[PDB]
DNA sequence: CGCGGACGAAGCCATACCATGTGGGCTGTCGCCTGGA
DNA sequence: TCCAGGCGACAGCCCACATGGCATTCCACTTATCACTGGCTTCGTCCGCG
RNA sequence: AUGGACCGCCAGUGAUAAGUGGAAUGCCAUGUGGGCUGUCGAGCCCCACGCACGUGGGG
């Protein structure tokens, strides 16, 4: 009931997702450098790409309040009868002297200080329930420092609503324990399988417009690339997705449009001016029925060069899957899918044909 | 540690008066950014991260603009000297000094030419003795030196900024 | 009768279980700074999946008072009933006037200052005494400050229900000093074989409904992550764990599933953001008839790199096990299971094919 | 006529025995903390370990009274009967009104204040002294306050029993002078080569089952650990031992014994939870017929890292007993094992083979 | 001496993590640390310009200026409500008060008054973000300046803390009748 | 029978809440070769 | 023999970013243990030794 | 040769048994490094042959 998924995919000259100064993110594995790309980057795009695809539109804000107002006028309140409403349906939970909030602005509505995870549906059910109250949030509106008046119970039903992305990822919320539910997808930072180190580009920025005496651009920066063969994996616990969605066909859905999200999907990062998009050139998804099992330990090994990357990574995935294979044994199912026919890896399966009918038989098999 | 600044500062003044003396050894040891180095900087060596840290710099010396190449505070001290007087930016310069001081030995070798030739541009005093000694302290112990550029660039940046008013 | 156990398993880049300020657990070994795994984390990872397989749900808590009012109230009681019957469960023990309990919540059972360690079965056994009173717990909620009127002989020998968890962790219990069972494995921490550093990951939380179309994002931090190559051991006292057990039978399946727990498990420490779900890379289990013996004094000397850690470091064992061998000579078994067939690692016995095989042929021979 | 030994012993990230608040005991030496181990537990390891194998069972107790009792609850006598008895032989054993008690506590026989140190057949045949005289003793019970009726030569010379743990530690009673016995092998702590500072691990027990709005940890503490590599030395005089023994092979299967016993042993503090069981990575035993001597100057520099300490400490210990030998030549006796062949020890001896090797071609040399 | 620059800080860290979550945030990923640790290297731009002029004075400085920023936000909330104390009194007041456990208090003071330079910063952060997780009104110019001579002798300034803390703790159970 | 060694006999005992400020001492360097003084 | 010069030719300039964001709750344990020995005074007698 | 000379406070000791820091997270949106260029006589010694212009051999 865990879906693991594995794959090669070597990226060209660009940089994904930058540290806080321009960098890129780099890992210090079995000694030597290796540039790499979160996994909340990646976690991301699939995020957008699933529930693109399956719209539900997951929106993870902090300005609740804006949006529950926006809602309120839209449906006939008044500016201030809609802001103090939102505040209200915001502040009615009442855990500790209600929810906590930023230092409240000038004159905008202010953002609550946890970042909420709900969908669009949630948010106009809660404008729902507070167009039910008009009177009671006049009358404390009428007041100086008003208290909750809205049913807790029932807008805190509304908190947990889940939806295929709160499913798969998981929700937090401090305040509100009751509707945190856990993530059912271990999705792990993608190395490099080769040391890396980072080229400095240097960059001008030319003005299309002269004067005499000076032929200086408009700027001058060194910002950072690299590029290189990522490992990426991720994990699926199949028994905790069905426990969250409910439903089977609902969670078989999910991972299914989960694992073309993760093999197609490609962060926006850095990318409109260096286009790295790119496919995956060895998929490898096993279904493991007591407990999932990384290939990261093969790349410990940092590999040096000369050569191509590619070859040397698939055929050592091979080995490390094969030798593994033969030390823990289980009756488990594995299939791949790979961009390159002139080896033939045995200890990953059986070949299918493409990527989408890799997932579609996988998926299949799991339930 | 003082052992290593007085033949620094022995090969600044030198290298100095020869970059402005013979043109021929200036863009010889300027090629770097190195059989030069090892013909003409050797001598004043006595770790190789020591060494390069010499004709590193040296082919810094030898690669500035002739403005501030006819021409005690560290690097911190340059940079916000150069910040509040010359008019370069804060938030840039500052966010140049971290990313300077998160790296490693070899990374501040590829980081730092380009910073120091460009405050260099504006004929700001660099102490090339500490910064030989602070590149070769760069081996010793890293984070240290790092930590004392960025909080000495703070600490003169907000102490003259305050002594202005 | 000591069933040793050695593992070298490589983490990638993860951070199993955090310190109280964000960074991983480090030691200070030959010198340099090493990313460490608490015990207590490997030890607890390992008991929820031994009562997982075995179940045995040997739950570990504070709130006896309220699953104790909860049976209550399942096989009939009142609340009031539930609640002060349960307390007076708790209360009749002790030599004093009852076990140490402080400062109780709002409207909900209080919580003893101790913790206990008891199976599911017991909490059910301790509502049934309980039950089999319900006209003196009547009778002692009448007053105002009601005393001990349970029989504290049955239900302190309920109290002592061991457990395969309780069996191989061990239990304390200082207000009843008859029931504390000493445990029977020496689980140790897991440091890395070469110094690690830390390695701060700055992250972002994006918000959607964008407010003045900045790229200005909901959240911004820095969490502390680390990799590398994990050492990792483990003793069993086998003399003592049949004392523990009792029989011989129901200790070689708690050993054999312990072994195995302890290769499969990993434990749950920020894994939802990074999959470090692995393998040990090499396993050796040792079966010595004199004292248990750990092989840390080997990776003392931190090994330099920009090459790999899996191979120098199987092969350095290797080499500390046939001079440590040959210095402490001794009549034991050795056998290990490798992932890797390049060297051959002679000291460490004869190349079992597999880890669940290996286990077998080894607590046979226990 | 002195067998010294020497060991350096490298433990992993551990807490042996812990200060009165935790800690690890710590020495202020050469300027630097240096953690350590107190000689009195590892005596203890060692006596349970060397009176293990002789299953001689040295008992240091304060409840002498209490097995007394037992011991003629078991042979016939009625419980008041054995209690009064085994006052009585206790309290015809001092100057008047016997040895000093304490304040009763239960209606359990009192403790003594002074901690005993007899072997088990000791308290027996005590017993066995309290019977012999039935009716003496039932007589003296009758009155309020008795005395002594035991003749004190007889329990005084039974209190005088020897054993190997007795013989080699040595005992300590002042109410009887006449049973003190000095011990025959010094003992010294256990410190650091290297400045070692103590790290603070944070461990949360946690509750299993959940509570309704919250879930929070069960108990949130830290606890003090350390890790490094431990000196440690110990002398056995010879002379003195064979003299409290009196003969000369059991004085030699003491000896044997005491050294096997100092290099495996290691304490049982916090071992349950850290696993640091180790051999020391060096042994040195050298038998000097002039007076014993350490090597504790040579590691007065502390010695900075980053880099291992084994070989460091090895070479280092090499160096001072080269130039110590050469500055206080003297004809001894030299050998010495150790776990590392990479760089060749001459100062210390012929190179045996194994530590059990080593200990017996150097107890038979002497 | 060193008081009134301890007072500067408290001012300026005071008013600032409540006022801008830039600092507050760079300062908070500092607590118990070296003032060289990369992971530090954001908060020298506010806490650098203060330090007068051995490192156990800068150690004071920034390990405080951390601790003042990574409290909870009911303790900003309250510190932020509008001879004197050092922070022992601030342990005898929060168990007389708001019930601590007094046998555990203790033996957690003297564990720290007995230790080195070094273990009196990494035991102290979750020592005092325990104390201001139960509100104590506890006094920042003090401790750092106590941290800050508590490197010349470990005599100095722990027994006046030990000293103190008993000494309030009698006072305010005597001044209970 | 003659006697060693060890103890014991007391005199003695003891109604008109607050504090601490300190430090300072060690180290060696080059560019080499021809010409002229 | 020592001080001093020298040692083909090796580029100049100009420009260097603006903004926005930095989270919350909770948990902090128990009990048992804490020694003796003495540094006074003379003599007579008493139990054990030879 | 000093209110001193001679002069041991001292023989015995496990601090012990128990413990997840844990759940959540795009660092992002924008950039010419540019204008200019042929790589074409002092040297230290020996010997040989020499048209006293030099040529070759061994150091």
Redesign the interface.
Known sequence: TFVDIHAIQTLPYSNINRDD???PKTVVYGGKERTRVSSQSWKRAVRHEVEARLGDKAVRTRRIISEIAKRLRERGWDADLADAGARQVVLSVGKKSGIKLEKEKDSEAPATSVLFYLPVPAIDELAAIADEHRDAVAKEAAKKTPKGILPADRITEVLKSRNVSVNLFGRMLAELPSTEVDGAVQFAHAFTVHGTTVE?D?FTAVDDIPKENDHGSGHMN?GQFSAGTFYRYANVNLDRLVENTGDAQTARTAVAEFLRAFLSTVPSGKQNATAAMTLPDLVHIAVRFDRPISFAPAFETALYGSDGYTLRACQELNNYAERLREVWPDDAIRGYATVENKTDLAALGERYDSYPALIDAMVAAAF | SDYILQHADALVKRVSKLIVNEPAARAALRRGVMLAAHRVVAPYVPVHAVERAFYAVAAIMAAQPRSARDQRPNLGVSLAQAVFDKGLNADST??RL??I??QNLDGVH??LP?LVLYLRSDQVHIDWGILIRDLARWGHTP??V??EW???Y??TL??LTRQAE
């Open positions: 100064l321009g960098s400095v240097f060194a | 500052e966010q971290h990313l001081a998160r590829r980081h380009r984070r240290h790092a930590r960025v909080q000495d703070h600490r907000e102490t």
